[PDB]
Design a protein around this ligand. Sequence first.
Ligand SMILES: N[C@H](CCC(=O)O)C(=O)O
Ligand SMILES: N[C@H](CCC(=O)O)C(=O)O
Lengths: 256, 256
Amino acid sequence: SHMKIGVFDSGVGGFSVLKSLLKAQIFDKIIYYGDSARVPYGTKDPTTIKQFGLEALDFFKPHKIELLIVACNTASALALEEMQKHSKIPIVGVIEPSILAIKQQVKDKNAPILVLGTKATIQSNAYDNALKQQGYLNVSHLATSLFVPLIEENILEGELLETCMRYYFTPLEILPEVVILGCTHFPLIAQKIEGYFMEHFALSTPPLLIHSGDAIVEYLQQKYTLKKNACTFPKVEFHASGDVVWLEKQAKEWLK
Amino acid sequence: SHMKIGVFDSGVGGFSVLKSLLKAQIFDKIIYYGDSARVPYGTKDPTTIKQFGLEALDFFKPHKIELLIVACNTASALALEEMQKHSKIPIVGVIEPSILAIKQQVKDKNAPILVLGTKATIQSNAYDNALKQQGYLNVSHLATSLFVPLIEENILEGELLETCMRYYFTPLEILPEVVILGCTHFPLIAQKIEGYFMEHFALSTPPLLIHSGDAIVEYLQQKYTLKKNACTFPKVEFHASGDVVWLEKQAKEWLK
Ligand SMILES: N[C@H](CCC(=O)O)C(=O)O
Ligand SMILES: N[C@H](CCC(=O)O)C(=O)O
């Protein structure tokens, strides 16, 4: 409520986290920056992504933010440690809050958990390592790269999404009880992913989906003793490396 | 057989143009630069893309090249004019040579022509304007954005690509006689596009496809009086804004 906060993402996907933040009404001043000139990060190499993350700090320096949310799971997996080393404010990414959500919500440490993410996020084993450190023993991972461009084309239903889901999911050995939506974009197809598993494995109830935005809202509420529903008319500024009007038009859609 | 040339693309797609160049054996020194940290360009805005094009000129400054090939159809569509104004050496893009190839190969100016490209290339109407100025009266265009990420995942066949072509091609009202592959990536699915139009319309021969790389080779060979097969062992150098080892590994596959 007092704190001026930053939200960093590679592009418009971070609006899924911003939506979660706004719904909770916990912050009163939010500065969003999407690196839309250079998105996606997920298909790129660690060196490049780490440098992207440091350059994001340069963007926020003049804004005098008191906390930075790295809404991007890819930048969280690859760049967050380096950004924190070179940062006088707290930087909170979206991986660790989801590990806490799993701890709270998934007491069966042998439940089959499936981590979905970009190629860079999955190849970093960020989630697998943190989950193993907390005793989870039945952890699978799957890079679902094409979900990102599909979702940015607003293809959230239909034959093409069903065939893409089939393409990525048919090779899975284990049926998951928990799916980690380890990418900003994947909340927009959360019901379709749930519907995919109910349809094809005769489930009555879908696996549990972990939403990165909801988990970080929960963590920040606890960590900063934030009253929910306290900030009903926040100030939100949008910034981008690409065209800002384009990014603002997409914000209108993602935050609806 | 002596000019030091540069080839610029947003990433690895420009290897389809490099393939055409190498086969023609017309140049002896080629400096390839892919902006792999920021690819794709085609989903981004004109201001961003124009500036990307000028920054490519900066990359090439120490290389002191004599001709720049803009292999990227998106940069050619949006950035070429400004780059040419800001350059003392000739810059050749991949749109105008394709207009020449159509003039040469398509004498019926009422032949239905379909331009396929990125969202930005199509929105620019670069192809339509040039075709119309040459008297072609039956020009349609179609942005097929998702072909790019599919192709970069090496998905060049199978039901996902078939479903993606149906998604983009089913709404077509005109059956093309000629299809312009107005994107670096689309040569890799050229047969699949040909096959699609023969099946869903029973053709006994496919629409004619225009390949950007072959069209620029033919143009350069006439413009500079270059003797094919003169340079059997060219020096080819790869540069990238992302990890250049990753880019070089993709070259091996695209140039095969
Ligand atoms: N924001 C990225 C998805 C888009 C990208 O690859 O940059 C993530 O959360 O993984
Ligand atoms: N090189 C681009 C395709 C990839 C991109 O969008 O940057 C083109 O030829 O249009």
